[PDB]
A = this chain, B = another copy of it.
Amino acid sequence: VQAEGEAEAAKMLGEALSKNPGYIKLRKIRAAQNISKTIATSQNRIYLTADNLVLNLQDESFTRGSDSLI
């Protein structure tokens, strides 16, 4: 039963994502946001990279996102 559901989902979803998988990326961003909320009140000890704060403006990777748009 679970596999029938998954196969039905996969057909249409893969047909949609074949043209452009950008949705995944957007979905991924949303996932991160959701996870952040979940992590805000969690009991875990979390050590994140300060790169998440995009505060190092002189870093060579600052323009990577924009450079990927050319």
Residues in chain A within 8 A of chain B (CB atoms): 3, 6, 10, 17-18, 21-26, 28-29, 31-32, 35-36, 39, 46-67, 69-70
Contact = CB atoms under 8 A, between A and B. Distances in A.
Quickly give the copy total for this chain: 3
Given A28-B65, A52-B57, 8 more contacts: A29-B57, A32-B55, A32-B57, A39-B53, A47-B50, A52-B55, A52-B56, A58-B64
A55 B28 contact: no
Contact of A51 (B23, B59, B64, B66): B59
A32 B54 contact: yes
B48 A50 contact: yes
A41 to B, nearest CB: 12
